[PDB]
Design an enzyme around this catalytic site. Structure first.
Site, short mmCIF file in Angstrom:
data_model
loop_
_atom_site.label_atom_id
_atom_site.label_comp_id
_atom_site.label_asym_id
_atom_site.label_seq_id
_atom_site.Cartn_x
_atom_site.Cartn_y
_atom_site.Cartn_z
N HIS A 98 -34.62 33.82 27.55
CA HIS A 98 -35.12 34.58 26.41
C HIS A 98 -35.91 33.67 25.49
CE1 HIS A 98 -35.14 37.29 22.95
NE2 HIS A 98 -34.61 38.22 23.74
N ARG A 122 -47.97 43.21 19.41
CA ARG A 122 -46.81 43.46 20.27
C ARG A 122 -46.56 44.91 20.62
NH1 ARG A 122 -40.71 40.74 20.16
NH2 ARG A 122 -39.76 42.74 20.90
N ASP A 174 -31.60 48.07 27.36
CA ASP A 174 -31.71 47.10 26.26
C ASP A 174 -30.70 47.46 25.16
OD1 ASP A 174 -32.56 44.80 24.87
OD2 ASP A 174 -34.67 45.14 25.24
N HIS A 194 -37.27 37.32 29.45
CA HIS A 194 -38.01 37.80 28.30
C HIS A 194 -38.87 36.58 27.89
CE1 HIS A 194 -37.94 39.29 23.83
NE2 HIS A 194 -38.73 38.24 23.87
N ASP A 208 -36.01 33.63 22.31
CA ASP A 208 -35.29 33.19 21.12
C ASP A 208 -34.50 31.90 21.34
OD1 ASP A 208 -36.23 35.67 20.10
OD2 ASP A 208 -34.25 36.30 19.41
N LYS A 245 -30.11 34.69 31.90
CA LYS A 245 -31.17 35.27 31.08
C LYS A 245 -31.97 34.16 30.38
CE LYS A 245 -33.51 38.20 28.47
NZ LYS A 245 -32.57 39.07 27.74
N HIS A 256 -26.78 44.38 26.22
CA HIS A 256 -26.23 43.46 25.25
C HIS A 256 -24.81 43.93 24.91
CE1 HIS A 256 -30.06 41.57 24.04
NE2 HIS A 256 -30.46 42.59 24.73
N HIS A 263 -37.02 41.75 12.72
CA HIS A 263 -37.57 40.40 12.65
C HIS A 263 -37.76 40.00 11.19
CE1 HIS A 263 -39.27 39.23 16.80
NE2 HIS A 263 -38.41 40.20 16.99
N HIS A 266 -29.88 45.60 31.78
CA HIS A 266 -30.28 45.02 30.50
C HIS A 266 -29.33 45.45 29.40
CE1 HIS A 266 -33.96 43.42 28.19
NE2 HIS A 266 -32.87 43.31 27.44
N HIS A 292 -38.19 44.42 30.27
CA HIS A 292 -39.14 45.17 29.46
C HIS A 292 -40.57 44.68 29.69
CE1 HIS A 292 -38.52 41.71 27.10
NE2 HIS A 292 -37.31 42.11 26.71
NI NI Z 1 -35.89 41.03 25.48
NI NI Z 2 -32.57 42.65 25.34
#
Ligand code: NI
Ligand code: NI
Lengths: 122, 100, 570
Positions: C222, C339, C363, C249, C224, C220, C139, C323, C137, C275
């Site tokens: 996700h 969350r 992550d 995710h 978003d 992936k 980025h 966020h 995981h 996660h």
């Molecule tokens: Ni995520």
């Molecule tokens: Ni992530």
């Protein structure tokens, strides 16, 4: 209970080295005027020429001391050491170029040793 | 200044030792990196003062004590080594078991 | 002649029955077996055994069973066991685990572990040796993250990103053929193994598939980008054809479905659930129920690991600041409250301890720490020993069972999940020589030396201007494996079979070793070593309590952790 990061907790007992191999005690003398230190795994008949001992008794053997340690002989010092048997194929190549093959060829090893002056051949 | 690679690296030891000394001055028990930094910078500054290698090997064992540091820190540090410019050129100082 | 055990262990590292503490934790590992022959231990130095005619053979050429590198006297901690052995490396791969030296004069020498003229030696006596960590995981946001990962013993980064673009700052995605090609080219200068994930989003197959053909190693999904039933479905169809893994995710917002809808879109197909506890993202509040299914390979990310008294406060705020939530807007706060849950985070500690969550990951830079996957794995194991006591399956006073269950989470399981365990993830013969040496006092905190493809890549080492390498300042530094062209031979770019068949490496001029992604569509939770439990996880929608076999899974948060303030300067 005080924490020493990464500490050992060793089991009980002792570790027997070179177990089940024949041991031999011999007397060795440093006849030179400089110090000689001998490692655990050098074929004992091929040590420095100036060490006087029964060379036949070093053949096919090494020091019976913990792997990676050495025995020390000061100038003129005579002492007993204990030897153990080589293992594996019981062949030795290089070092002093006295064996280069099986350690069973005792007469050939002793001939080369005597001709090159490694003290202590009969 | 003509800083060479080691001079700049070693500046960071001094800094880490200043940081650790401030931490010690407000009451904290020091950790591994902090203790190492304080003893290392002590040695380097002692070389800059003209002490001998043998003096620093003795003094280095008394800079920090076990009550200055966290539990286990004494036993994590087997030695501390540092090279500094003495009056007679670069030399190595090794402080064995600095904290007991 | 006999050597007392304390002395033995000081000279050659511990042997059968001896135990070693992991860092400043309460965890103890015990040597299970030892491949040596007492008295013929290998060692290197003045008057030592690996010398010509002695423990070093002076006859054989390199090709005749002689090693490029011998790690002497390693204490191996791996899913396959906790035991003492020499490790022999050749052509960059682990070729022998056993006893090294010279068959001339030593007993018990593994036949292809001859120390010869060609052999380099690393003394591992008194060290713990593990496989390099596999972080799935990642980025790719800031290139400075690679040394951060190497310093905590991570040797493979699987993820996505193009740098600090908002797509990449939120999601482990390198989108489309061109971004993927650029990041494969970038990857030529990163001193770590890498695998790139494309965007697992779309409603037509082609846009997704072309990413795999371009060189992506997986996908992936996700929220978003829209973690909808269609995007889930199309990604899994592409994956099943391409033989690559999909990470997910899921839809936190439950916008197009609830967990059961995401599971119905998945439809029994294999998927990696990122996660899984859900603070990092996922259907609120019950995403962690994925970890009970047979076709899910579940991982945690690391900021919830383990559950501590600052965990909630730091997460609540982290979530609000990334966020751009406002404590003024009620929906924003209901969202945060749905969350970030103490109930699920506490239960995540215990699901790790039971073998229900199989993997750890970072992550890195999106909601996780690049250099703390290994660190927090052990802190979690230590917390669980204190709160739950030793697992039933333990021995003496060893924590060996737990240790193999937990080392498996960041080594072999991630590798298995991503289709790369033929190359990496464990200390086994035939696998790439990605090896981490640790002093026991620093275990899991700061790596001594990190070996990549059989050459050291990273080390904690001192003043470069000194007479010896140990003088201060000792710090993590890149080693010769990272320099010049050697960075190509010591690291692997993992790619899909179709991009390799289509000659992407040659099209792009990639010089790195190319690793093939395979065998990841016919695995499940049963394939997760020591972490293979499938069960019914119930998450109460009102109270968020977690139940497994009718019992509530709860534990307290801790005020203090080991592997923390004794070690770190900040
Ligand atoms: Ni995520
Ligand atoms: Ni992530």
């Amino acid at each position: 209970n005080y924490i020493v990061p990464g500490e050992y907790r060793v089991a009980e007992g002792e570790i027997e080295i070179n177990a089940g191999r024949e041991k031999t005690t011999i007397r060795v003398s440093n006849t030179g005027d400089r110090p000689i230190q001998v490692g655990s795994h050098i074929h004992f008949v091929e040590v420095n020429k100036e060490l006087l001992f029964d060379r036949a008794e070093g053949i096919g053997r090494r020091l019976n001391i913990p792997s990676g340690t050495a025995a020390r002989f000061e100038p003129g010092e005579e002492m007993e050491v204990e030897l153990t048997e080589l293992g594996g194929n019981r062949e030795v190549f290089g070092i002093s170029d006295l064996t280069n093959g099986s350690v069973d060829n005792k007469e050939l090893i002793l001939q080369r040793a005597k001709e090159l002056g490694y003290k202590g051949v009969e | 200044m003509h800083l060479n690679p080691a001079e700049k690296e070693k500046l960071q030891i001094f800094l880490a030792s200043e940081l650790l000394l401030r931490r010690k001055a407000r009451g904290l028990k020091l950790n591994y990196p902090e203790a190492v930094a304080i003893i290392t910078s002590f040695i380097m500054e002692g070389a800059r003062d003209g002490k001998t290698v043998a003096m620093l090997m003795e003094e280095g064992k008394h800079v920090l004590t076990r009550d200055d540091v966290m539990e286990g820190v004494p036993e994590m540090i087997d030695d501390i080594q540092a090279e500094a410019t003495f009056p007679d050129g670069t030399k190595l100082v090794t402080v064995h078991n600095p904290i007991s | 002649m006999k050597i007392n055990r304390q002395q033995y262990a000081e000279s050659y590292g511990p042997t059968v029955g001896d135990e070693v503490r992991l860092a400043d934790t309460d965890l103890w590992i015990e040597v299970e077996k030892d491949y040596t022959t007492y008295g013929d231990e290998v060692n290197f130095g003045g008057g030592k055994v690996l010398r010509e005619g002695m423990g070093e053979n002076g006859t054989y050429t390199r090709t005749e069973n002689v090693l490029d590198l011998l790690l002497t006297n390693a204490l191996i901690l791996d899913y396959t066991g906790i035991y003492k052995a020499d490790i022999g490396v050749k052509d960059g791969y682990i070729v022998g685990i056993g006893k090294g030296g010279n068959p001339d004069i030593m007993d018990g020498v593994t036949p292809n572990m001859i120390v010869g003229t060609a052999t380099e030696v690393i003394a591992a006596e008194g060290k713990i040796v593990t496989a390099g960590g596999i972080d799935t995981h990642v980025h790719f946001i800031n290139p400075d993250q690679v040394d951060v990962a190497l310093a905590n013993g991570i040797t493979t980064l699987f993820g996505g990103g193009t740098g600090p673009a908002e797509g990449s700052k939120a999601t482990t995605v390198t989108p489309g053929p061109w971004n993927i090609e650029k990041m494969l080219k970038s990857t030529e200068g990163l001193p770590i193994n890498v695998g790139i994930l494309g965007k697992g989003h779309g409603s037509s197959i082609a846009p997704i598939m072309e990413q795999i053909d371009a060189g992506a190693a997986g996908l992936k999904i996700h929220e978003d980008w829209g973690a909808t039933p269609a995007s889930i479905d199309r990604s899994l169809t592409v994956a099943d054809e391409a033989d690559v893994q999909v990470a997910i995710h899921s839809d936190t917002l439950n916008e197009a479905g609830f967990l059961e809808d995401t599971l119905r879109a998945i439809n029994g197909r294999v998927i990696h659930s990122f996660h899984v506890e859900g603070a990092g993202g996922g259907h609120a509040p019950d995403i962690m129920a994925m970890a009970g299914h047979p076709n899910v390979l579940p991982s945690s990310t690391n900021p919830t690991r383990p559950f501590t008294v600052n965990t909630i406060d730091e997460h609540l705020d982290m979530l609000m600041v990334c966020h751009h939530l406002k404590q003024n807007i009620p929906e924003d706060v209901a969202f945060a409250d749905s969350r970030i849950r103490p109930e699920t985070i506490a239960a995540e500690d215990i699901l790790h301890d039971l073998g229900i969550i199989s993997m750890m990951s970072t992550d890195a830079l999106a909601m996780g720490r690049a250099g703390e996957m290994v660190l927090r794995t052990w802190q979690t194991a230590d917390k669980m020993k204190k709160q739950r006591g030793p697992l039933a399956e333990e021995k003496n006073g060893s924590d060996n069972f737990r240790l193999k269950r937990y080392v498996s989470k960041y080594t072999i399981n991630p590798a298995i999940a991503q289709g790369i365990a033929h190359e990496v993830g464990s200390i086994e013969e035939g696998k790439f020589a990605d090896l981490v040496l640790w002093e026991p006092k620093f275990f899991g905190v700061k790596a001594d030396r990190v070996i990549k493809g059989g050459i050291i890549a990273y080390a904690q080492i001192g003043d470069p201007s000194a007479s010896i390498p140990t003088p201060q300042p000792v710090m993590g530094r890149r080693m010769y494996g990272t320099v010049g062209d050697l960075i190509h031979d010591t690291n692997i770019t993992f790619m899909s079979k179709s991009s390799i068949q289509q000659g992407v490496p040659a099209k792009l001029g990639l010089k790195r070793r190319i690793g093939t992604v395979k065998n990841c569509r016919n695995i499940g939770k049963k394939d997760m070593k020591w972490n293979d439990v499938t069960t019914d996880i119930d998450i109460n929608p009102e109270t968020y309590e977690v139940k497994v076999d009718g019992e509530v899974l709860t534990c307290e948060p801790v005020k203090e952790l080991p592997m923390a303030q004794r070690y770190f300067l900040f």
